[PDB]
């Protein structure tokens, strides 16, 4: 692809400290000021059921892969203009690699 598989522990704690405020990963987690993101990797941007997206987010229509989310998570905002996650972005690529390592995994 062009992200290449990084440390899954590195990872876990990455998200711990820049996603976990906004968001639930595990299944049966709750949605909070961002959607529980189980089941991620393949579906499109704005479908889990029970949020409330931006209309920005639904109508973007991405289809999410460790690829995708990659450049997402560089720059939100800048992918998705007008979506309301308040993310600056992950700008160096091995973080973003070590963080998407460790989602693919615990989102399945
Ligand atoms: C609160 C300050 C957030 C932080 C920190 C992160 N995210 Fe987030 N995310 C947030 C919201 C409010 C939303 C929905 C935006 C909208 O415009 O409707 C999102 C969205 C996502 C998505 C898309 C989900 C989908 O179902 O399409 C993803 C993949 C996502 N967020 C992931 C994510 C990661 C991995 C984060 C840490 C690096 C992260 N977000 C930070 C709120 C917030």
Not at 56 to 66: F, G, P, Q, T, Y
Not at 79 to 96: N, Q, S, V
């Amino acid at each position: 692809t062009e992200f290449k598989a990084g440390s899954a522990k590195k990872g876990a704690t990455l998200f711990k400290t820049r996603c976990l405020q906004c968001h639930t990963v595990e299944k049966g987690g709750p949605h909070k000021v961002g959607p529980n993101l189980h089941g991620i990797f393949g579906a499109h941007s704005g479908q889990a059921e029970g949020y409330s997206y931006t209309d920005a987010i639904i109508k973007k229509n991405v289809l999410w892969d460790e690829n995708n989310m990659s450049e997402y998570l560089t720059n939100p905002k800048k992918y998705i203009p007008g979506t309301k996650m308040a993310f600056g972005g992950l700008k160096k690529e091995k973080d973003r690699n070590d963080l998407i390592t460790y989602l693919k995994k615990a989102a399945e």
